[PDB]
Amino acid sequence: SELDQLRQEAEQLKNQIRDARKACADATLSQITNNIDPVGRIQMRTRRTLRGHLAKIYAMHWGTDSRLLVSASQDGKLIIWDSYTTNKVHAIPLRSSWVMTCAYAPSGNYVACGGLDNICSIYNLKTREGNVRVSRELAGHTGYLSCCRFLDDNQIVTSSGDTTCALWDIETGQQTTTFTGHTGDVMSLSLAPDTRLFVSGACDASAKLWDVREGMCRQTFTGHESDINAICFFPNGNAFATGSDDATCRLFDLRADQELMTYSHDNIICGITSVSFSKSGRLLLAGYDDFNCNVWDALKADRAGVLAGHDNRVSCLGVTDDGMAVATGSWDSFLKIWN
Amino acid sequence: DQRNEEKAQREANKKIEKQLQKDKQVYRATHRLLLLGAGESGKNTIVKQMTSGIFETKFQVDKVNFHMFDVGAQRDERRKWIQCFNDVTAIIFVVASSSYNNRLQAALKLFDSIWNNKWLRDTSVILFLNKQDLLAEKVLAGKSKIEDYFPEFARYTTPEDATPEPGEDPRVTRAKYFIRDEFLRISTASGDGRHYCYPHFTCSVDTENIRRVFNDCRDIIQRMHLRQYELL
């Protein structure tokens, strides 16, 4: 009785949201950008190849200075590479070799990583003793860590398979804010340029918007027919894109609260592993299970170019802060820098 | 001085590369194993016979170091994190089929999903049918609910090559091999040489378990080596 009417009421809210979203859909993104000049045949070639990793690379992240980068591999290493001279500056072993994420602090003095150990480790790269050691360990989660990004040197936001997202205080090493609005495993997250809010896509094929300051869900995005694997935030801070196992990508926007344009082809029958926008936001580079990273145009649904220099499945990729280089990490333990 | 920084960068790379080369030998000298025992399947006893999300157990046999990972404190949604173990030597699967109330059918579907997984198609899976003693006592019970769940058991015939354990009876041998035949049929349905399933019978406190996986692992590497030379 009481349960039945609650579900009936919930359906009425769902119907109203569909009507409200339909009413605001005065036009589609594809129709407006029909007359825009196509990007052209984008041809990109490898410039550097880092062969220091042993096992498959699962995550990588660029630095604020756009020179140094940190990458995570399943062999249990966190090697910091100088992308200019190809040399490596640090190589810190990890207690657990099963790591699925890594982060680079905006100040560049901290590096974090996590994985199937349900904990997040913080390392300080500016030790006065000349060697890098772990600083603080966060053990409030009960599931495998999927992503983690720094707000500053004191607070870090993490997502895991516990369906929940967490906000941490590094100095105290204790939980501060918990997000419990999902129904599936959270796979990735991306901070907005202003840091005030972030999005996270889970296995429910739904993307949420959370406000860090009060820890409340702002809205929910739907439209995917398979679990969301990767997500990224638009440089302007008013949109985001994601990819799922259904072999297609989607672009959403916070203001309209609905999907705008999807990228897919009949050939593409493989899921998306990584997604990140370009510096201008015009190019959407997305990894794929077929050893390729198609460069999908944002304004135009037509594909602009591909890069197929990876031996195995591409697991992670990232565009530089200055937009002068793109580094990709695949399962063949080779980091590839494209320009 | 730019030149001074160049020397510092070069020596740091040389020291790190030397450490990486040393760590490469220890990484290649160990073999990874994944323990995917179902719930209440007695997998804990299989380990001890000789908010952490994983329990790494290291054991050495025949001067060979092995790395066994027991994934714990994780939700039942194993669709995503299972892809991390695509490079494992073999996935150890422990089934308490004797605990049917319908545990066998649930484990039957789980093995089918693992066998046909795209990333796990190249990973061999070794199978342990645990609780063999408890299986015998439940089968001997009057009107055991094995035919009710599996009506095909009423017409299945024991193969002539089925050697029994000294002191048992044909009926418990019937159910013990009937469950094995179903698992073999699932494995051989789409196992076109990419990976193989190794069936075994084990007890809860069997110390031979480490020998069986060690022998099974040796066959996996030998089969892979033959595949390199295209002999298989």
Partner: nanobody
Framework: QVQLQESGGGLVQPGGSLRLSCAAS????????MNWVRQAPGKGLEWVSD????????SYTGSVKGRFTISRDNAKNTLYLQMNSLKPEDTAVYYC?????????????????????RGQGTQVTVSS
């Protein structure tokens, strides 16, 4: 959104007949493998039967083999379950689940208690 509406059920005497229809929307019906799972009262969740993407491959659990019949209609994106000669143990809540990844022939967490792409469910009770 990905939802799997279910219709049917009711009160049927033992040994009778019944039909259940599961309706899918929001995704390509033919691309996803469909499974049938039910929850018995005061018990866990179990799996009954599944159908391939094209319907050319069918598997049943032993308890309902020769008793229930499964069918899918990709033209009208519906999943059907025809039952004959019901038994008292048939009383359970039937859930219409699906394979999250379309193109692959395997899937996990179909019987998981926190599965997302599962139908609301319908109550089927059999009694004298």
């Amino acid at each position: 959104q990905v939802q799997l509406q279910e219709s049917g059920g009711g009160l049927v005497q033992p040994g009778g007949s019944l039909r259940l229809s599961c309706a899918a929307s929001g995704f390509t019906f033919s691309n996803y493998k469909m499974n049938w799972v039910r929850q018995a009262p005061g018990k866990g969740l179990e799996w009954v039967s599944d159908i391939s993407q094209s319907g050319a491959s069918i598997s049943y659990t032993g308890s309902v083999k020769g008793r229930f019949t499964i069918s899918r209609d990709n033209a009208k994106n519906t999943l059907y379950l025809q039952m004959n000669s019901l038994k008292p143990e048939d009383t359970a809540v039937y859930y219409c689940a699906r394979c999250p990844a379309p193109f692959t022939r395997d899937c996990f967490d179909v019987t998981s208690t926190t599965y997302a792409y599962r139908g609301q469910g319908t109550q089927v009770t059999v009694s004298s």
